[PDB]
Amino acid sequence: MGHTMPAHTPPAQTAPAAQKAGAQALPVTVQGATVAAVPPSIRDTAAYMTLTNKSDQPIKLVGAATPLATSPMLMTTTHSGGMAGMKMVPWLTIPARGTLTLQRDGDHVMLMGLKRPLKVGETVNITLKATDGRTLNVAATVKKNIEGR
Numbered sequence: 228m229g230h231t232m233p234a235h236t237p238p239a240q241t242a243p244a245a246q247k248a249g250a251q252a253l254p255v256t257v258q259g260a261t262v263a264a265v266p267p268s269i270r271d272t273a274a275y276m277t278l279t280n281k282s283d284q285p286i287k288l289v290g291a292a293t294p295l296a297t298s299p300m301l302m303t304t305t306h307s308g309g310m311a312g313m314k315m316v317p318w319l320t321i322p323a324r325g326t327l328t329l330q331r332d333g334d335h336v337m338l339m340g341l342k343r344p345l346k347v348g349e350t351v352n353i354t355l356k357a358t359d360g361r362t363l364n365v366a367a368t369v370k371k372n373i374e375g376r
């Protein structure tokens with residue numbers, strides 16, 4: 228039509244790269260979970276991962292169910308993650324900007340009470356459950372990673 232494309236006009240950027248840009252929303256855990264094959268600290272263990280928020284909404288993740296650990300307990304001791312308490316919290320709400328790093332003693336999930344023997348290099352499914360109404364299946368890679376450190 229003049230400049231009615233097609234096309235957009237658009238592209239001085241600003242269709243971007245859309246595609247996807249405009250975002251829609253990216254469900255705020257574009258992460259490949261890893262779980263530590265038995266630490267030198269009894270069967271109990273944790274996930275080693277990072278929640279990567281790309282939506283900026285107050286999401287509340289409160290599940291980490293898996294044929295791995297019996298007692299999946301949420302924990303939070305990083306002053307930018309959930310909280311400052313390495314304790315069995317409710318869960319961790321990510322008040323937008325959930326760019327927190329789940330590490331053994333710096334906010335995490337304690338996948339406590341290991342059921343069955345694990346191989347460093349295996350992979351077991353995890354089903355997370357945010358009470359925003361998510362029930363998301365993810366592949367969790369079973370390897371200790373920088374442990375006995």
Ligand SMILES: [Cu+]
Nearest residue numbers: 302313331337
């Ligand atoms: Cu912990």
